[model samples]
Target: ADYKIDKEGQHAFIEFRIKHLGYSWLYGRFNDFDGSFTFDEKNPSADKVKVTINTNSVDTNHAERDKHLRSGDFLNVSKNPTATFESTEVKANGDSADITGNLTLNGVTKPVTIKAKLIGQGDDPWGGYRAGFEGSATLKLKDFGIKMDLGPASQEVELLLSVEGIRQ
Candidate 1:
């Protein structure tokens, strides 16, 4: 088996979940992003992943709130337009793996680590071989220079990713 990913199509997504004013869970996703992962089926630890997300693509379904979040008070899209993560460490655990890397957002960079579990691999009806991954990591908004703290805005945010990498 081999792994070669296509960043477009149905291969990638960057999404998040965070508490809203201590009341409910607010969910959103970045609509525009692209990157790749270097993986070798022969050895799981011989891998690394990198992703770039447009800060302006934040969508919470509420236009006004989305605009506010993209402003200087939060992401400051004009000054810092993209968020990125590149894996520096990949540790294998049977069929699962752990990734550690640097996450840059709002012009700040911090270490981020995630627990990734392999969702298995297979052949598609469309005549393609693919590998799937599901991972989650918790990050502090403040660490990324997201300064907004009003309205009991929770500092903790959960990052989630579901990726499908095609063999090429």
Candidate 2:
């Protein structure tokens, strides 16, 4: 049987940017996430993917601000502990692909599409199979009922992802 992921040699990183009071962009990263994908370049229709991110793992460099984000005013980590994405359609387009999925955040489920690229695939020096990918997507917080700061801050949020995975 083929492996799904070589956990130790795999690393997935996700970064998000959102307007803060219309003054500047606030960036954050999710430190913990796990997922699997069955990807076929030759047969895009056979691709399947699922990912889960820990809401409590949000980091933005500011402790106080991070705490506030975890509160009900924002993500409310205590109430909704995780964010998940399950791809329903994967359409290939030359060097990139469009990943259409149902994203659940703060108890709200919405359809979202991610523009992704297969960065590369190779075997690690340690003899582990790996694949790398990069993707980005945009969404409005208000669309998911996250209406915390509606004044100057833009409701749209940008998600950037760079993931490296080992064959499991």
Candidate 3:
């Protein structure tokens, strides 16, 4: 089955958190992104997904910090306005899966594994079938050329993703 992410319903998210000043967490999200996936229960080779994020849509609930994030020290949205992910493999285990993919961000590409699991799948009230999944991953800032140093404790960011896909 092929599914398109339900972005119109705002059921998809690309959120993240990182240590702020080595004391607390600072949460943020990319407000605009899209993707789709092919799912098959019996074959790992039949599972695949791809996502693209608009770097300029980054939001941290603070204007100044978001501006800084778009600068060359961080996302550098001026030169590189997008980030993407394309899965290379889907290894299922029990109810969870390890989605290995290449993440291209800040002009650097790196392989990252997202631990994901199905949340639910069913027919919606609107006569549409849907499936949702939740996933998480930890990323080192420097690995993607994000050289701005917040602190020793802020070297990494944690991603929390949830997506509901409409069966297409």
Best by lDDT: 3
**In candidate 1, residue 119 scores what lDDT?**
84
Clashes per candidate, residues 3 or more apart or on different chains: 0, 4, 0
Question: Lowest summed-lDDT stretch of 10 residues in model 1?
Answer: 1-10
Q: Residue 75's C-alpha lDDT in candidate 2?
A: 88
After superposition, candidate 2 runs with Cα above 4 Å error: 1-10
lDDT of 2 at 14: 78
Expressed as tens digits, the lDDT of each residue in 1-168 for candidate 2 is 122533344467779998877889889998778888877757768877788988998999999988988889888899899999999999887879999999999889999999999888978888877777888999989877785875656889899987776676
Any runs in candidate 1 off by more than 4 Å, and if so which?
A: 1-7, 151-153
lDDT of 3 by residue, 4-73 (tens): 9999999999999999988899999999999999877666579989999999999999999999999999
Alpha carbon deviation, residue 130, candidate 1 (Å): 0.8
lDDT of 3 at 112: 93
CA shift of 158, model 2, Å: 0.5
